[PDB]
């Protein structure tokens, strides 16, 4: 699963999704 948050453990299956997390104001300015 090459799609794990840079903080949580919210894993996805693709980029469109992982990005959806890094898209919203989740928590990844780094
Ligand atoms: Zn996260």
From Swiss-Prot:
Induction comment from the UniProt entry of this chain: By mitogens and phorbol ester.
Zinc fingers (C2H2-type) by residue: 3-27
Superkingdom field: Eukaryota
Domain remark text: Contains two sets of 2 zinc-fingers, which are widely separated and recognize the same DNA sequence. There is a fifth zinc-finger in-between.
Record note on quaternary structure: Interacts with UTP4.
Reported function: This protein specifically binds to the DNA sequence 5'-GGGACTTTCC-3' which is found in the enhancer elements of numerous viral promoters such as those of SV40, CMV, or HIV-1. In addition, related sequences are found in the enhancer elements of a number of cellular promoters, including those of the class I MHC, interleukin-2 receptor, and interferon-beta genes. It may act in T-cell activation. Involved in activating HIV-1 gene expression.
Listed name of the protein: Zinc finger protein 40
Species, as recorded: Homo sapiens
Lineage: Eukaryota, Metazoa, Chordata, Craniata, Vertebrata
Part of the intact protein present: 2114 to 2143 of 2718
